From a paper:
After extensive screening of detergents, constructs with different placement of affinity tags and sequences from a variety of species for co-expression and co-purification of FlhB with FliPQR, we were able to prepare a monodisperse sample of the complex from V. mimicus. We analysed this sample by cryo-EM and determined the 3.2 Å structure of the complex, revealing a single copy of FlhB added to the previously observed FliP5Q4R1 complex. The FliPQR subcomplex in this structure is very similar to the structure of the FliPQR complex in the absence of FlhB (RMSD = 0.6 Å), whereas FlhB is observed to contain four long helices in the putative TM domain (FlhBTM), forming two distinct hairpins that are wrapped around the outside of the FliPQR complex. This extensive interaction surface between FlhB and FliPQR reveals FlhB to be an integral part of the core of the EA instead of an accessory factor. The soluble, globular, cytoplasmic domain (FlhBC) is not visible, likely due to flexibility in the linker between the two domains. Intriguingly, the two helical hairpins of FlhB are joined by a loop (FlhBL) that literally loops around the (closed) entrance of the FliPQR gate. The topology of FlhBTM is unusual; the helices 1 and 4 neighbour each other in the middle of the structure, whereas helix 2 and 3 flank the central pair on either side. Despite observing up to five FliQ subunits in different FliPQR structures, there are only four FliQ molecules in this structure. The unusual topology of FlhBTM means that a long loop, FlhBL, between helix 2 and 3 (residues 110–139) connects the two hairpins of the structure. Most unexpectedly, this loop, which contains the most highly conserved residues within FlhB, is seen to wrap around the base of the PQR complex, contacting each of the FliQ subunits in turn and inserting conserved hydrophobic residues into the cavities between the FliQs.
Type-three secretion system (T3SS) are multi-megadalton protein complexes that are capable of bridging from the bacterial cytoplasm to the extracellular space. At the core of the secretion system is the highly conserved export apparatus (EA), which is made up of five predicted transmembrane (TM) proteins (SctR, SctS, SctT, SctU and SctV in the vT3SS; FliP, FliQ, FliR, FlhB and FlhA in the fT3SS). Here we present the structure of the TM region of FlhB bound to the FliPQR complex, in addition to the structures of the FliPQR complex from Vibrio mimicus and Pseudomonas savastanoi.
Numbering used by the authors:
A (entry chain G), F (entry chain H), H (entry chain I), J (entry chain J): 1 to 89
B (entry chain A): 109 to 299
C (entry chain F): 10 to 260
D (entry chain K): 29 to 221
E (entry chain B): 105 to 299
G (entry chain C): 104 to 299
I (entry chain D): 106 to 299
K (entry chain E): 108 to 299
The structure:
């Protein structure tokens, strides 16, 4: 293969990392923003209050997005297995 | 020196791909170099079965029923071994190695065995690395996803190499892994 | 008794192999490299001028000349090791600025380092070294050296060891040239989280700690890969001219 | 009083002053690093002469940093006194148990003030996320151009855009402080009303 | 062949599932290689004799006992050795993997007992590392829970530092004794084989 | 096994992590909220006062919930040991 | 073939792995990157092996090897007589609940355990040895965890959040090990655990 | 041993952690409360004034309670050494 | 083959030096800055220096007399066992050795006529105890620096600044102002009281 | 050595930490108090004004107390070097 | 066991320790890849040891190869330039200590044994490796402290000024020309 093919392949990989990390962390970041807005409004300065909401939401987002995330990784592995013949030559 | 025969075969591509694999998915010193060498040496027996049939039933058995010059066998064994080698080497690597040996441009399948062996091992190293670093890649997503899900919520210290290992095993099982890696490595050789 | 005649060329070749970026790496059993450098000597046997005979292998005159070629070998492949490190450092700059390895930043001691983007850009620098056939040029450079740095006629001069030990500055300059565009974008995000912490001190390392820097550091690493071969082509010319000056070769 | 005007007066000026005082702070730090990296084996083999080098470099460096930090000091001081004045009332600094009464604290904590500062808070992240991400995108081409540039002047051209990004992001909080100033002025009267 | 024989006699036996499972276990436990590799490849080698007792007894009765009397050697002895090994391996290769590898080989097989050894062994290993990965992945989860709960209690209290792996190591050592540990895993690694 | 079985198994695991972390951290988060309400009401800005109450409560919740937590982990290990036959085939 | 695996089976037939696992769990408990070398741990374990199995080695050499010096019978009395002290050592240290499983999995159940086969006995011995090694290591770990948590809490109470309470707690662990005599207590409960 | 024995043993350990952390941090938390009451009463908003009193008191409490704390840890180590025979069987 | 090389390492007083210098490396906060290999090298030379008397004695009693050879495997091996055992017994604590001789159960009237398989276990449990005592003594100034730096940082307000990237130059100052490696590697050699 | 000797040694160490931290931070805390009294009296609520005075004073106190602090650490190192013989036996 | 020895007797000890010091000073931990660090320190050692190895070659190797002296006598003669090098890097006190601990003192440092000089050489090489090391740390520590001070005076106090200070450290190390500078102070340090 040529350099541009492998760069295209790494763009695919970094795009997977990006959309998975987004899917899992966007809910946690949103609830962090919400509870931090609460802290700022009520003038509460308790800098580890945000942990349990963010953790519950990360676990629930791993439960909700877990199936299609594993399907997306499985499809990526398969698509790099069919991509092997053009490596072969 | 008698193990060089095995490096002439398709042993140097499987060992490298599997050594990339065990390092790709978490495992340190899981299946050890000895186990990987064993499994790859069995996969060569599986893949090189037509070549070993060609050599045995055409240069070894007539040597057992000698009726022939003893060294002549090494002439009839070199032919079907080379035919496997030459369909696997890139043409560019073979041409550069012929220039490097200094001889003039000759047609392929006439190049000497001594010029074909290094042109084969380097072309198998290129292939093994380009296959392994592609299979490496789905196991590098999980490493980067996990280590980004942790470092987002923090924890700073939970090693992403022990929390992502179950996920790597899970993915490698769901894909079935070995039925696609050890199977596409046997259909990786066209002859 | 072939080995007594071709041990020194085999030593130069097998010494370059042990350090070279692809063949001399983890993932390749040492026996494969041994039987590779031993097979290369049979192919380039015509392109090797006569070794100095009247010098035995098991003698001080032999051990001196053998070490003086282990040095040439190691010094040739180490330059490709530098070339790949140029890109490993890219990964471990954009990863440590996106807070991906952060325990090793607060604890430069034992700490906890995650070399993930380093491993990814190592895979790049190796697939570029292989795709654009860098290993073939790397072997042509050795085979050219038996006529330019002949066996038993000098070695790397003292002006070459200093020019070769200056490659750490070149690595740190190249890894900054490639990743300057990522560094600026990542600092503009770290400082934006900082302005968030300034305007509203409730946003913390707990509230949204390392969650913006992380997404943006992944997006930047994704955006860098497009124009990343144009830099490998730049630094492979330097890595190749260096070796073409080590073995003078008039290049 | 205002808690955001004092928060943006520090950031704007910590970028603005950082520009011109850093054009020389980087020079001082450059010379210090250059002097500390160069030694000649007589300054090495006796630890009495290295502390002289360290002191000389540090002193040459203290002036730009102190000039940064004194104008940051002044910006912070003038920023908070933007509303009100500098009347020195020595009675407000004497221990009064009525300030920590939980009734008054609860009353000022909730009410309209909590709603307005909750509105500001969800705005302090939208601005810094829609500017730091707009500028990182609207400046995509020039910022990607920094890699393929002549060497000594691409680092300078990159640091001369990081500071402009910082200035813009720190000045975008002007609407946050703009919705705050009349609200604090109105509080200064409704509490009296 | 002498340089690879110890690695070839291993893959025909139950060594490869047990070593992989036992080495995933110690990564799960966080043990920084406290059972050295020469300890794990000894434990899994004793378990190999224990598991293949029925196979090694048949080999001794059909190969070594006739070898003592020298009835016929080097042709028949090798076949009488391959037969019980083929029976043991063939009872544990997944049908899917056997069919995949036979199709890759190209030879037509009509009797699954009549597959060649050279197609069976590579079809046996890929169905053995898969089982080893499933087993060692399942045995991991009770330890990932402990890691992720300790690493969360620590962060909740506020301690970004204080690596969990030292504070969560006694909890894993406790759990691995309460559940009887090596008596459960080294027994379901022995009841795993239908032999 | 199939992908959906292993996803079901990871939901079990993440559910254990969730209920254990909740059981241990909910009391600590509640006392953090209470002492932070105290700080806000008395206008006390002392941002490490919340540590000792939260730590005492986390240790007491590890003492109180420790038995059933270890029983729940033990039952989970056992339930993945009986789940091995359907891995075997 | 069976020459690179002997150094892995002779040290498991004896009581060598309990000491190594215990001392490596200890080294991990100190929170201190290794500094005993793995060679040091393996060496003091090998010496404690000769120190513990002396009642068995002084019978292997007495009844099996030195009679093999007069030679009196070749490769028979050794093979079938060195098993007696080894079996009598290992059978005394396997848990009954732990050896019953391997007997029921072997399929051959005998009333007298002394008549059990060696291939059935050695796995049960390893399983009963690693269990006790983990119990001992877990016992000894707790004093080096109280210090971890006390130091981490004292630091975090002050706000000193970036101190890594693993380097500041290292002197306290290094003290607590010397105060309680350390190596004597631990290498004397290890040596005294093989009661026979 | 049984699970309830090891749970009893961990209650002992968590109790040691609790009483040591209390002995060292209660004085520091008290002086933090006092100096924060001072700040609130004099309306002084200087959020790192509390550090040096709290640090001096933590060091003096490590000096005062250091002896019996090391004696209590030493007695705990000894008591888990006599507790080994009932592990042995 | 791999078990034997550690034996001669354990027999000599090589372990005390490595344990102390490695605890020291951990104290200074350097990440393998004195790398492992150079620590083993330093300890090897310090062992060739401390054992120079014992090695001179075995060069005079067991190496040069092996030329006429006079003797084989009966009193030439024990000849080497003797000076090693003398030095070891000079460096083992009585409290340790009386704990292992009571465990073996074989009583000897003279503590010098102790079996080797009981003395070396009693010798290493004293080497490690001494090495931990020395390394603990040495850790303390670096702990004081790590705490003073952390407190000054936390006072100035910069809570989120690791006091390890800023306390390492000071740990390297205090290690040079006191002459450092001169002192420590002198008290290590000065601990093998002969 | 005995436990009480090592406890005595740690009291020496904690006393050094205490007097050094006091020497360096007492001036910074005093100037923080003074500038905070200024803020409270003039009713100025600018919570990062206290930083530059406190930093200048911490640097000047590191310049003033630096010599005797390094002498005190050097004397402590020396005194633990003469204290090694009674460790030896 | 021979490579590590001959490496210790050379300039490798000071160089590799200074490299590992600088690698922590940068903040890019493990990024220059200890294989590369060791390779570069090894290239440097050959550049520094050019005069020493030239002397070893001319004094001992060249007569022995031309059959002008025996083998043992050439081996004895080869140590004279190695010791001449090592004596210059040792300090007087670090030599006096390891001489006094043997009893057999010397009138001049040239008569000292080798196994007494090498311990006195490494203790004086680590000392100067750290003397250069903290002088490397200082420029980077000052960047760290200036970034931290500006970010603190600005407010934030929560940005962890070590992730925002890594690029500044790197830009300023490469902009001041960095390596070459320190290179010329590891070459001048071994002045003969």
């Amino acid at each position: 293969m040529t350099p541009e093919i492998f760069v295209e392949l790494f763009k695919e990989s970094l795009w997977l990392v990006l959309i998975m990390v987004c899917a899992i962390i966007i809910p946690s970041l949103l609830i962090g923003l919400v509870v931090a807005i609460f802290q700022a409004a009520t003038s509460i300065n308790e800098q580890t209050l945000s942990f349990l909401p963010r953790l519950i939401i990360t676990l629930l987002a791993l439960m909700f997005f877990g199936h299609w995330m594993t399907q997306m990784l499985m499809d990526f592995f398969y698509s790099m297995i069919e991509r092997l013949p053009q490596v072969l030559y | 020196l008698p193990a060089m025969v095995i490096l002439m075969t398709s042993f140097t591509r499987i060992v490298v791909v599997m050594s990339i694999l065990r390092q790709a998915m978490g495992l340190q010193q899981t299946p050890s170099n000895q186990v990987i060498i064993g499994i790859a040496l069995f996969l060569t027996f599986f893949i090189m079965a037509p070549v070993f049939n060609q050599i045995n039933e055409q240069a070894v058995q007539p040597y057992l029923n000698e009726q022939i010059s003893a060294r002549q066998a090494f002439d009839l064994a070199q032919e079907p071994m080379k035919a496997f080698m030459l369909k696997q080497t890139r043409i560019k690597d073979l041409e550069t190695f012929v220039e490097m040996s200094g001889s003039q441009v000759t047609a392929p399948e006439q190049v000497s065995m001594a010029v074909l062996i290094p042109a084969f091992i380097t072309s198998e190293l290129k292939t093994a690395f380009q296959i392994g670093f592609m299979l490496f890649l789905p196991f590098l997503i999980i490493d980067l996803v996990v280590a980004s899900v942790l470092m987002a919520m923090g924890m700073m210290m939970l090693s992403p190499m022990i929390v992502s290992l179950p996920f790597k095993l899970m993915l490698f099982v769901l894909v079935d892994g070995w039925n696609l890696i050890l199977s596409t490595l046997a259909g990786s050789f066209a002859l | 008794d072939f080995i007594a005649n071709y041990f020194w060329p085999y030593t130069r070749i097998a010494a370059m192999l042990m350090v070279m970026t692809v063949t001399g790496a983890r993932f390749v059993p040492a026996r494969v490299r041994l039987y590779l450098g031993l097979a290369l000597t049979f192919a380039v046997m015509p392109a090797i001028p006569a070794v100095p005979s009247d010098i035995a292998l098991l003698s001080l005159q032999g051990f001196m000349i053998t070490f003086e070629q282990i040095v040439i070998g190691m010094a040739m492949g180490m330059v490709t090791q530098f070339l790949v490190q140029i890109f490993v450092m890219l990964g471990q700059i954009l990863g440590m600025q996106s807070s991906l390895g952060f325990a090793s930043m607060v604890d430069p001691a034992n700490g906890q380092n995650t070399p993930l983007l380093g491993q990814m850009f190592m895979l790049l620098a190796t697939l570029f070294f292989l795709s654009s056939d860098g290993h073939l040029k790397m072997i042509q450079l050795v085979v050219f050296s038996f006529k330019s740095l002949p066996i038993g006629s000098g070695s790397l001069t003292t002006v070459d060891y200093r020019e070769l030990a200056l490659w750490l500055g070149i690595m740190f300059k190249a890894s900054l040239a490639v990743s300057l565009s990522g560094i600026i974008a990542l600092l503009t995000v770290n400082l934006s989280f900082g302005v968030m912490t300034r305007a509203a001190p409730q946003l913390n390392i707990f509230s949204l700690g390392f969650s913006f820097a992380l997404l943006v550091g992944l997006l930047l690493c994704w955006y860098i890969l497009s124009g990343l071969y144009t830099h490998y082509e730049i630094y492979w010319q330097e890595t190749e001219e260096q070796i073409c000056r080590l073995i003078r070769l008039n290049c | 009083r205002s808690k955001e005007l004092a928060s943006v007066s520090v950031l704007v000026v910590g970028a603005v002053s950082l520009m011109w005082f850093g054009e020389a702070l980087a020079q001082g730090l450059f010379t210090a690093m250059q002097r500390l990296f160069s030694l000649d084996r007589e300054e090495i083999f006796d630890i009495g002469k290295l502390f002289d080098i360290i002191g000389g470099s540090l002193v040459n460096l203290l002036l730009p940093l102190l000039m940064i930090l004194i104008t940051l000091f002044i910006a912070a001081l003038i920023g908070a006194a933007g509303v009100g004045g500098i009347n020195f009332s020595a009675e407000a600094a004497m221990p009064k148990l009525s300030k920590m009464n939980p009734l008054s604290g609860f009353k000022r904590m909730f009410g309209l003030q909590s709603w307005v500062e909750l509105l500001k808070s969800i705005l302090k992240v939208m601005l810094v996320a829609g500017v730091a991400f707009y500028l990182i995108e609207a400046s995509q081409k020039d910022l990607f151009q920094l890699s393929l540039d002549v060497y000594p002047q691409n680092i300078f051209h990159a640091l001369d855009i990081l500071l402009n990004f910082v200035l813009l992001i720190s000045c975008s909080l002007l609407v946050v402080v703009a919705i705050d100033i009349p609200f604090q002025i109105w509080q200064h009267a409704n509490q009296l009303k």
